[PDB]
């Protein structure tokens with residue numbers, strides 16, 4: 001599938017997804033932006049939209065501040081929607097673990113809300129119980145919302161869940177290109193802001209000891225110990241004050257028990 | 259709890275509901291008309307309303323015609339909202355089965371829609387799988403909307419679901435006073451209207467129950483009350499004709515349109 005219609009956006013795909021044969025051989029796919037069902041023609045989509053009664057993901061809203069929500073979706077309850085989500089995601093992922101056996105997985109769907117509904121920005125999948133302590137399986141932001149802070153938001157959100165349940169976590173390897181950039185950029189900003197104010201640091205922040213030690217090495221703040229480079233710490237705090245991140249996870253706005 | 263603020267209505271309660279102790283001993287409760295959360299003060303409600311972004315039940319709209327919708331809410335998905343709904347309902351119910359273990363239940367919320375949102379009129383709960391074939395557990399209409407046709411609408415709607423999935427159904431017993439009146443009045447009008455459109459063509463009970471979705475038991479008791487039962491249906495024509503005459507002039511102001519239901523069983 002070369003391109004998809006997803007609501008009011010026409011979006012050019014990055015990769016191929018295993019949509020069933022009779023859909024896979026089509027040049028364009030037509031998608032409901034709310035239930036994520038896939039269809040063959042624009043007249044079929046226009047007729048689904050008239051009779052479909054969803055304006056949000058089919059799940060419990062665990063976060064809402066400003067016009068930004070997170071819905072906590074269970075693969076064992078809303079199986080078909082989560083399967084549809086996995087096929088949508090692969091169009092913008094180099095690879096992903098599974099598409100169908102979604103029942104042992106949770107799906108945190110990020111939306112941006114207006115009068116017309118809760119429109120899908122992106123998501124991250126998570127194993128209900130992961131032996132390797134992975135707090136993220138796959139993570140994805142749709143093209144139209146990229147380079148605007150939603151990526152950092154979701155990564156920060158994934159670490160808040162880990163903190164709340166009192167276990168340091170890590171994304172499942174290997175990561176996507178934009179994934180690797182985001183995660184490294186996140187770890188940098190968090191560690192620098194957290195120092196202005198290792199085993200102790202990992203506890204406060206919820207980042208795996210491995211992930212922290214590699215980030216310090218990249219910043220040249222590692223003796224063979226943490227070397228405080230102040231010019232780096234001060235100038236980062238200056239960069240945040242004179243523009244600010246407009247999209248920011250407020251811990252007080254999370255309604256969730258682990 | 260004597261009285262509740264529910265949107266733009268102050269409403270006097272009929273019964274007590276098991277709201278937790280620290281709320282139960284209060285003279286008034288303040289309720290969000292959209293998410294159904296309960297609060298202690300007017301200033302607390304005014305501050306919830308600013309940051310709550312809901313103007314309808316948090317679920318799939320399966321019906322909308324004129325300014326009337328039905329939302330299909332699942333106890334296993336929107337657990338807390340359905341729990342809040344159960345506590346709201348008990349304030350106007352003599353009794354109800356459960357309040358908390360809502361996960362095996364579906365909740366059909368009826369709304370009347372204007373520019374300010376989808377405002378709650380009433381609901382009926384239903385077991386996802388009932389061994390006794392109950393198509394309604396509890397049903398309730400809020401006072402301000404009573405005696406206006408919303409009650410008959412929801413009962414009619416509950417039987418359309420039963421028809422669609424191809425099983426005759428019945429409300430869980432025992433029924434409330436207004437429940438018993440509505441249901442008996444509904445069964446009468448439906449059986450009489452359903453007979454006018456058979457010209458003469460003699461119909462059986464098992465065939466009638468299939469067309470209408472009403473339990474054979476419920477039908478046989480209604481015929482007995484109307485004196486239209488041999489030991490089979492005795493068509494009293496003057497009764498059938500005069501009912502159709504009553505509908506022709508008045509018209510039923512709120513009416514379930516089967517073409518407007520977007521739902522698979």
Ligand SMILES: CN(C)c1ccc2cc(C(=O)NS(=O)(=O)c3ccccc3-c3ccccc3)oc2c1
Nearest residue numbers: 092140141146147148149150151152178179182185
């Ligand atoms: C398609 N796909 C698999 C994926 C996978 C992952 C991502 C991430 C993003 C993203 O847009 N990230 S980001 O919000 O731009 C950001 C990430 C880290 C650090 C900073 C910022 C930032 C902050 C403010 C302004 C601009 C940038 O898109 C993605 C897409």
Ligand SMILES: CN(C)c1ccc2cc(C(=O)NS(=O)(=O)c3ccccc3-c3ccccc3)oc2c1
Nearest residue numbers: 350397398399404405406407408409410436437440
């Ligand atoms: C509180 N609770 C458990 C309940 C439970 C059940 C009900 C039912 C009703 C209702 O209002 N039903 S009604 O059909 O609207 C109606 C009731 C009486 C007298 C007349 C009419 C009527 C009929 C047709 C056109 C206009 C008016 O309120 C209810 C409240």
Ligand SMILES: [Zn+2]
Nearest residue numbers: 032034035052
């Ligand atoms: Zn849809």
Ligand SMILES: [Zn+2]
Nearest residue numbers: 290292293310
């Ligand atoms: Zn609310």
